[PDB]
A paper describes a structure:
N6-methyladenosine (m6A) is the most abundant and prevalent internal modification in mRNA. In mammals, m6A exerts pivotal roles in posttranscriptional regulation and its dysregulation is implicated in various diseases including cancer. m6A is installed by a multicomponent methyltransferase complex (MTC, also known as the m6A writer complex). The mammalian MTC is composed of the core m6A methyltransferase METTL3–METTL14 complex (MTC core) and several regulatory proteins including WTAP, the adaptor responsible for METTL3–METTL14 localization and proper substrate recruitment, and VIRMA (KIAA1429), the specificity mediator that mediates preferential m6A modification at the 3′ untranslated regions (UTRs). WTAP and VIRMA are important subunits of the m6A writer complex.
In parallel, we obtained the WTAP protein alone (residues 130–241, WTAP130–241) using the Escherichia coli expression system and determined the crystal structure of the WTAP (2.40 Å). Two molecules of WTAP (with the assigned density of residues 150–241, WTAP150–241) formed a symmetric parallel α-helical coiled-coil homodimer through hydrophobic interactions between two identical surface patches. Specifically, the side chains of residues M158, I165, L183, L204, I208, L211, V215, M218, I222, L225, L229 and L236 from the two WTAPs formed a hydrophobic interaction network. The structure of the asymmetric WTAP171–237 dimer in the quaternary complex is similar to the crystal structure of the symmetric WTAP150–241 dimer with a root-mean-square deviation (RMSD) of 4.2 Å over 134 Cα atoms. However, compared to the WTAPs alone, VIRMA-bound WTAPs bent around the observed N-termini (around WTAPA residue 188 and WTAPB residue 185) and displayed a more compact and dense conformation with distinct intramolecular interactions.
Numbering used by the authors:
A (entry chain A): 23 to 119
B (entry chain B): 21 to 112
């Protein structure tokens, strides 16, 4: 009798849809939870490697400044040594008629 | 000689490259993840719809059959009433 068989067919499809929809749902929750853990792990590694780079950038900044001062000090030392050398040469040349 | 600018410069370059390569690879992974999850979501959306349409098909058939059974009960109850009435007249 078709009332009975249609009732059975309906129940069987409802059970399939309901079991399916629970799987889609549990699958989405598991995926979200896995992405969350992985994104948190990444943010820890990001924060740490930025700190390490930022410390080396500070040192590099200090060193670029030191090098610039060294060039400045050397230039002035060279200027003063060159003018003394020149004066001695001018005195010698003059002293040789 | 221990901590020159050249050494620091190389160290900062090396660190920047590792950080950028990491951020890139992980960016690709996030995009691939979203692409796959979008694809699955659209696939299930379709399978869902066709399962729902199948169910609704039989639900409508079942609905008609419940209606037809209710009709049959009504007709049978009426026929039984009329037959018992005629019969009753012969029972005296």
């Amino acid at each position: 009798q078709t009332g009975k068989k249609l009732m059975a067919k309906c129940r069987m499809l409802i059970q399939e849809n309901q079991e399916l929809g629970r799987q889609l749902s549990q699958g989405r929750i598991a995926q979200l939870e896995a992405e969350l853990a992985l994104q948190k792990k990444y943010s820890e590694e990001l924060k740490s490697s930025q700190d390490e780079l930022n410390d080396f950038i500070i040192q590099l900044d200090e060193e670029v400044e030191g090098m610039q001062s060294t060039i400045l000090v050397l230039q002035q030392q060279l200027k003063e040594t060159r003018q003394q050398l020149a004066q001695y040469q001018q005195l010698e040349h003059h002293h040789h008629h």
